Subunit: 509 residues, 4 copies
């Protein structure tokens, strides 16, 4: 009754997937832990099974990866870049089937699944160039006959824990950068996206093996919280990049700090869009729609708070409602479908609870609010007005398509309301005012890691660094100098002079 | 009996110090906490007293600094730079007396006390140029009609906790950089260097007042573990820079992580010098001496492990012995003194405890090992041979002048022995081999934040980032792009068109 | 009869000037060339005299500068930075009197003379930080056991030729940056600002001599085109920085290219302000007046073309006329004066010819256009409407206060009209439209080196690189990575291994 | 009779070459100028014909390129990078056969022809990443309410003139970087490598056309000095990159400077290897062999001067002689041939003339000196001893495999001898001495653009900047921030505040 055994889903075998798949890769494939079945959220049918990592699997994989690092760290960074280039090409070859798997197992629509693989392809191209560039300055020493250089070297083993919402691209961001920086990687993806993790690992493994490199350079140990906690506690995991909930990520950060490791934390968002009175409303409405209902509201960068100037609030809300009602719902792989299911049945439960807590806290559901009567985890995208900006349910991240709409009047108050939540990921204003734009970008503006103008809160490109502040965890991924998080800086002074130190009254020999 | 009440120490009043000083500054001076008396470690006589911060003082001061931040962050960075330049000048004007106070209260010799103030002067002058440079790149967006810019803005309030060993310059590094980055600062120095903290704050306060700026931009709350723990748990302290022991730093790091704050940790070191067979011994011997015994072995960067190749181990030890004999010991102000007292009597007990462990773990004290029979906290600079590289006492940071000497044979093993400890601050090799030097600097080389060649472990100027790895805590101060730790990065996309192209070409 | 021999001007002696001054400094003061008298342009009275450089003075000075380079290039950059810091302080000590000299000998108002000196002080402070920063990246070699480093090194002797309009700051920009980059300098300022060049060189000479450094590090050879041309042709002048007219700059650039030297050319401007229909007119009118009449229209960055959208053209012109009428004219050192003389009587003649030519090409003088009946080189600041944007006189740089005003309708054409002239220095639009601003800053916008929004064409700050494109010569000064022009880049590969892998995997 | 019509050479048609080829590409293929036939230097047989550009072709091509720029500059840099990525893949798919054509028409051996194409692939990969990174800093303005940004924008049309010795990679370095920087390109390669220029342009033109882009973005006008001079004089050529002889480049540099254009000049080398007494001779001898005889001594980076310490001179020469006699000579496209012909018959004559001149000036031919007894342009790689370092022939660049060997004793003199020539391209020392290595890299060391240690003068990687100093012309290509030469910097201040300027007494 598995989908991978039906003729309609035969394309799954193009990714090398079968009925029961090995979920551990360290140069050899295996898995002696619990066997997990993952389900298609569009119909709740089982897709295939994955043999997860036992503790012994984890132990042997970490040892094999660090052994492989001895080889990988001796490979010049530009030649490491060549490997990442080939990974990029291998992803290009499978972009459609891999994107389809993302839609099938995770549940986002096909263009977003394909677009997510593109992000990995993109960062591969970026990292290839970066592999000729990473380093530090040679600085002028104040000492005659001395050189002063800043060196950068790999940290060693980078553990990468990822969430269900971006089950390819977040790993890819960490993988391409960590790789060209000379690290080996160990991946534990979200258990409900295990087939995606296995499929991505198969693509990378072939490139490694085809280049006669040890496969443990890009190791995989599928598992749940047990394997993730072990990574957080493991002194052999030199850097732990964690992407997920603030609640779990706070414990991961503490465990890593306890052992003086390095952590890279990419945690929750509660992202606000602010529409000022001079906003182009033909930009505001489609932008708010995509940011709120894209990926069925399950992006870290999803717009969950919509602030609209009181003069235009009612008009925007009425246009947004008319917009929501035109969204095409269906199977995420089907043509022209813009809205699919939530990732889990539990997510449907959380969705309903938040809607009820909103009405209790004084909110009015003006669109949606209910589960859809159809197979899968489909709920209606939801718009709630009338809450106070500081209502509890508005300050918590609910990973579901619920948009809280607030009125405002004053720029200073609404900037403060953007910043008042514990999260600090993304933020957008819609305005034409030149000075307001530069205030929003300045020290009294948005406190978030992503600070946008006249575009939504979601859909970043790879050239810049990606991440957030406050409870979002502080880590950065992808562009700018995010690579430095994957390496260790040393400040190096070389005395090449024959000059002796000042004897200071001591008679040396 | 207070030294400040003796005419011999009247120069103290040139720093604004009195018998009883206020240890809280936030624009106004006060202090309702416990009154601490600090003592001169060269004679154990009381210098003067400082009224420390109560909880109410700390609450009041945090609030005033954060209000002051609203004014300060609005001042353009180059103009903040001009303030820091004036701080640099104000330190210059008092470098001799402030250096003397550092020698008096902390105990290092005058040239190091003066040189420590010069480090603060130097970072001011560096930060002035930086105040015109900080920012991020403008980047080419993949989308037409979009701008992509990386912005850097202040985090807000930078708490600064410092240790006794560098009671001026570590604060200075953090203050100069944090100020030009548009933050306000709150300083809690080591209790046993409270007068130094008050004196530095008096100097900065006059500059702020003279420029009609709120003095809380550089706030001070003298106190001990109670104030420091408050800062570590205080969500209003956006960045907590902590310089101190690994044991305390670990708890601070945990408390900051628990509240999703930012920390910059500068913790312990167990720094090694490695002398290969081809080393210039005329370079090795003085380098090792001044790295081991400088500041009476009380620097985070002090050389505590000396690895000498088998072929030259005996000669280097014999030459180092003959050199230790000529270390001139006296009061830290006595002209041409090289070696003063340890900071506390507890430091002496730790010194003796370590010498005793080393002798019982199989080491030989070839020089020193004894308390000096004189007033103050004086111990003999000490060299121990015969220990194994992995002896328990050698892997511990004993903050005292004990140099553990080891033999080695091969480059691979001694590199491993450098890296085998928990700390990761400073490291040095002495060699002429070109390949070995670049291997030391590379991915299979030293694992430390500071990686030196033919200079000891205290080779560090302000142009580079200063800090260590592993249990040293990972933070960086001073130069390179260390300033980014004092700011928050934003990635900013500006759509100035009338279109909505999505990243990665996604058609919704 | 000489102003320096009068009591009202005895403050000139504070700069060490006397009746007849040596105009050559190379560690010794001298001058065997012609003795020039410089005159106060506000009253045409002689100030003092300067002995200029002969060819033999020049020859000896170049040799001594290059000899001093052997010592100076061996001084670490941060310590060269400290020298520049002290120059900054010495300038600070004399800022009021040196500014007064600038107003007296050159003719700009006092706030601008002091402002010009402040710019030199500012770049000194900037350069002190930069002296711990200059250098290049260490890059990852594609080859095992190889290091790849970008080194930067001084080019050697930097000759600096400057113009009358900024007789302190242009040299200061070049001097501070060239010095921290490890070069020696040789300055030939404008003959009509010789006393300014001497006064500045006296200040720097004192700093060098107090530091026991060879004075030829900052050499001076006062003279005219003969000395300037000798520099342009001299293989021993490794970099020639030239600030001046496009006509002379083109010949200098060719002479330097002929000998495969390096030139940094800062030439003429023909700078446009554009006011769109949505512009803040309370912002446009004062910005245009300052940019047009500041320095009596004698800045390279002076606004010389004003494009106004046809909807607001008449209103802006009328408002600008009302503001011109209130410009306060008088002695440039008088503290209430906004507008002083032109620098020379030939400048007045060129002004009159351009007004004449503007009338003959169909322009209307709506304000000014006349020489003033008073001592000194005073002309009325002038506004001309009615010329076509491509009128020949509008495309010429006349270094005088004549502002040509044009109507326009659409953004596309007025951006082209900004770009159509041969000059490429500075440019400004006034608008509120977000997209227009980013189009202005993009590849189809302004082609100038300075591209401003809602501020006039003049008054840049030192944090950015300063200079222009096209006939402005391409050079940059001051901020960003302008310092690279004063240094030579080397790409350095060091094989520290025992193998010889070849680039690109070539198996030979 | 044409090689391309013999089945032996049928692989040439895989590059799209025919008996007669169009040598103009601007979206369409043409060529109404002189038809040239290029010859295989290995056997003096004609290969195929190329129709070169007439003046009318050149005119029409410049116009279409500048029209195409209006489209190309509006394409975001990352999307321009994606085109360059596809060019890289296109070159990958043709690397063996394109390199084979380089070997056939130019004459370098197969691994070098392939490696040259690999360089182009390498710079494509680099440029793709760079397309996400080009730009400047956002800087902190000293003024409240103002932003300060450094923008970079394309210059427009980049003319690229290249030499026969690297008929692929030099163009590739310029094309990939100029393309991602938003420029269009116009290529005029060496007439004797026209088939290579056509083959490369066919590869690129397919990529542009496949991406629905105007082909004039990468235009081609094959021609001689007349087309090259037109580009040098053409105001529409915003940047002219010229690679070739100092003699021609000097005139190109002066022509471009006359019109205030931009030039990037990559001219001759006279590169020296210096082997000190402590050198590893197992590295010296193979490195000198590859550097001197690679490409039959026809690289700008070829080693022409070999300085050997007196103590090891005779042994190194003896070992070099033995190494020379072992290289396999043959047709350069045959695998495992190590030594091919010179590029022209004239080059053979100039080789003989230089050998003759070396004998006249007192040199001894210790190896080689004669033409080889085989078809094609083959000469013996040649070693000359006994000349003085200042011998006229040693200071002339002769583009043939003649290596001049000199004795030296002292470091300072031999660095001076490295620096005494007019060229400043590449340089290398062989030594183990740490201090000597950093002095070589320092201000008193090599004056060249490429400063190597324990590797030869030739065979650079792409990650750093490539070029030289002095008569080498100063340009840089490829890595580091060489891309800035293909763009114009603007310093942009944006007043976003409502603050109106100070009235200064005027009633506005
Ligand atoms: Mg969850
Ligand atoms: Mg303690
Ligand atoms: Mg030729």
């Amino acid at each position: 009754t598995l989908l991978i055994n039906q003729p309609q889903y035969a394309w799954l075998k193009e990714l090398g997937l079968r009925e029961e798949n090995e979920g551990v890769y360290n140069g050899s494939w295996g898995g002696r832990g619990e066997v997990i079945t993952t389900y298609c959220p569009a119909n709740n049918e089982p897709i295939a099974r994955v043999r997860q990592a036992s503790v012994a699997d984890y132990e042997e994989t970490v040892k094999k990866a660090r052994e492989a690092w001895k080889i990988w760290a001796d490979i010049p960074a530009p030649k490491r870049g060549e490997i990442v280039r080939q990974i990029g090409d291998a992803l290009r070859e499978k972009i459609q089937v891999l994107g389809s798997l993302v839609s099938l197992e995770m549940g986002k629509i096909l263009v977003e699944g394909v677009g997510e693989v593109q992000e990995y392809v993109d960062i591969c191209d970026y990292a290839v160039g970066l592999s000729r560039m990473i380093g530090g300055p040679i600085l002028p020493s104040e000492r005659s006959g001395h050189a002063l250089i800043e060196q950068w070297n790999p940290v060693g083993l980078v553990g990468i824990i990822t969430a269900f919402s971006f089950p390819v691209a977040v790993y890819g961001w960490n993988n391409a950068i960590a790789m060209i920086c000379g690290n080996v990687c160990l991946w534990k993806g979200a258990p409900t996206t295990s087939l995606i993790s296995v499929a991505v690992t198969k693509i990378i493994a072939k490139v490694l093996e085809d280049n006669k490199l040890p496969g443990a350079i890009c190791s995989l140990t599928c598992g749940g919280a047990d394997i993730g906690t072990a990574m957080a506690k493991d002194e052999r995991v030199n850097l732990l990049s964690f992407t997920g909930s603030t609640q779990v990520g706070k414990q991961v950060g503490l465990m890593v700090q306890e052992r003086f490791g390095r952590s890279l934390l990419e945690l929750g968002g509660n992202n606000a869009i602010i529409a000022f009175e001079d906003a182009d409303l033909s930009l505001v409405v489609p932008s708010a729609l995509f940011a709120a209902v894209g990926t069925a509201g399950q992006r870290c960068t999803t717009a969950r708070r919509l602030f609209i100037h009181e003069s235009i609030h009612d008009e925007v809300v009425n246009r947004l409602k008319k917009a929501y009602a035109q969204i095409r719902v269906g199977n995420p792989w089907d043509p022209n479908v813009l809205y699919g299911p939530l990732h889990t049945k539990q997510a449907v439960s959380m969705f309903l609870g938040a809607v009820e807590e909103a009405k209790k806290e004084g909110g009015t559901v003006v669109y949606g609010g209910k589960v859809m009567d159809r197979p899968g985890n489909y709920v209606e995208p939801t718009i709630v007005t009338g809450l106070g900006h500081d209502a509890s349910i508005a300050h918590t991240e609910t990973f579901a398509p619920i948009l809280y709409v607030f009125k405002f009047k004053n720029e200073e108050e609404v900037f403060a309301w953007n910043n008042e939540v514990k999260q600090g990921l993304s933020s957008s204003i819609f305005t034409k005012d030149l000075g307001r734009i530069f205030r929003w970008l300045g020290p009294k503006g948005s406190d978030c890691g992503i600070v946008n103008v006249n575009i939504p809160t979601s859909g970043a490109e790879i050239g810049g660094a990606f991440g957030g502040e406050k409870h979002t965890g502080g880590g950065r991924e992808s562009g700018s100098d995010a690579w430095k998080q994957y390496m260790r800086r040393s400040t190096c002074t070389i005395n090449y002079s024959k000059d002796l130190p000042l004897a200071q009254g001591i008679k040396f020999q």
